[PDB]
Amino acid sequence: SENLYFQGHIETLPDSFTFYDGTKVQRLSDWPKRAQELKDLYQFYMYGYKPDTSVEDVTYSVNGNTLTITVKVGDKQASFNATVRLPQANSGYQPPYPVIISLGYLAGFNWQTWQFIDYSTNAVNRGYAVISFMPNDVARDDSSYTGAFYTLYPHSNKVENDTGVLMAWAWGASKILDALEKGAIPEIDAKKAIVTGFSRYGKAALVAGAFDERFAVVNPHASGQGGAASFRYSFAGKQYSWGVAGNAEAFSNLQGNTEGHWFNAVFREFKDPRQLPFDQHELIALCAPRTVLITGGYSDWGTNPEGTWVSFVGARKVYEFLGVADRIGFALRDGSHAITEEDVNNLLDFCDWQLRGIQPTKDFSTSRFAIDPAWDTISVPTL
């Protein structure tokens, strides 16, 4: 069954270039209106709503390596800590520096010793500041709906209050950027901010990049289903040259008691992902015209490697339409579900290119996957 002439399969991928009312996106000036529709769809049907930022008062305090972020909403206020690491002069770069805001530590896990491997060193040595926070401080990874976000915005089932945990974590990243824009760390350039996260935090990194236009680089790492991976296209059992694909995460697993708190109540009622009014090529395209880098592993089957490619190819159509196709990149590598040194180095190479003009040695526009006419069904509008 390796003859691909007889392996094709067609899903309907909701068209990025069709407005909610059925008319077509034709001009560059049409895109902002279409993007707002997609943001409204994703908030109502999947993640819940980002709160109005205009009525949040953000203050900060710096003590050694700790940046304390404090936010006040009405008569309530809540704080959480972020850890700051800056480059030295010997990096060959002077302040202010671009900054990687990491949801979780920028660090890998050694399965032999169960010790962590700090990759924030790689970043500061290449002239990137690193600010990390612990996402559970902002919202716990469960259905208690507690943490700094929910102190300020108590959860309920009313549409305006039914905000899921991934949107809460993304809000955490945005609050650090708020403090940086207010000059909390003068050595950091808030206009060169990069958001990154692994696995569950990679889903939230993508949400942060789609809903907060100030991030210059968005890096969902191994984000999988509910992140960059297509809901409608998965390839369990397909024979690749590096192996037979395992199962991608099941839609119902996203909705159940171990993960459903990531999303809202509407999302948890769907019977089938084909009922969603979008697929994830649209969430990625919400980052345009800012830059996005999809990283992960070719053998990380639960995150749906080729379905992530499907979403990337479809999202890139919007980037092409806007005239900035170079700003979306793809970089899977060998192996499985992990933060590896190569993942971090690929991010830093992508940032040096997009932010500093340094030409990369990697081709960020291709992969091991072919482009399959069966799923390559989003097309750029004619001029």
Numbering used by the authors: 12 to 394
Reproduce, without paraphrasing, sentences from the article in which this PDB structure was first reported.
The hyperthermophilic bacterium Caldicellulosiruptor kristjansonii encodes an unusual enzyme, CkXyn10C-GE15A, which incorporates two catalytic domains, a xylanase and a glucuronoyl esterase, and five carbohydrate-binding modules (CBMs) from families 9 and 22. C. kristjansonii has been shown to grow on a variety of polysaccharides, including cellulose, xylan, starch, and pectin, with an optimal growth temperature of 78 °C. From the N-terminus, CkXyn10C-GE15A consists of two CBM22 domains (CBM22.1 and CBM22.2), a GH10 endo-xylanase (Xyn10C), three CBM9 domains (CBM9.1, CBM9.2, and CBM9.3), a GE from CE15 (GE15A), a cadherin domain, and two surface layer homology (SLH) domains believed to anchor the protein to the Gram-positive cell wall. Collectively, the results show that all five CBMs have their own distinct binding preferences and appear to complement each other and the catalytic domains in targeting complex cell wall polysaccharides. We have determined the structures of the third CBM9 domain (CBM9.3) and the glucuronoyl esterase (GE15A) by X-ray crystallography.
In addition to determining the structure of CBM9.3, we were also able through renewed efforts to crystallize and determine the structure of the previously biochemically characterized GE15 domain of CkXyn10C-GE15A.15 Residue numbers in this section reflect the numbering as in the PDB file, where Glu22 corresponds to Glu1340 in the full-length protein sequence. We were also able to determine the 3D structure of the GE domain, which represents the first structure of a GE from a hyperthermophilic organism. As expected from previously determined structures of CE15 enzymes, the overall structure is an α/β-hydrolase fold with the active site located in a shallow pocket, and as in other studied bacterial GEs, there are no disulfide bonds. Within the active site, the catalytic serine-histidine-glutamate/aspartate triad is conserved and easily identifiable in CkGE15A and is comprised of Ser210, His348, and Asp311. Compared to previously studied GEs, one of the major differences in CkGE15A is that it lacks two inserts previously found in bacterial enzymes (Reg1 and Reg3) and has a rather different structure of the aromatic-rich Reg2, implicated in the interaction with the lignin portion of the substrate. In the structure of TtCE15A from T. turnerae, rather than a loop, Reg2 is found as a helical protrusion with several aromatic residues that could provide binding sites for complex biomass.22 In CkGE15A, Reg2 is uniquely formed by a β-hairpin, which presents several aromatic residues toward the active site (Phe120, Trp122, Trp125, and Phe127), thus possibly playing a role in substrate recognition and binding moieties such as hydrophobic lignin fragments or a xylan chain. A similarly positioned residue within the loop is not present in CkGE15A due to a sharp turn at Gly115; however, it is possible that Tyr212 could play a similar role, as it is in the same spatial area.
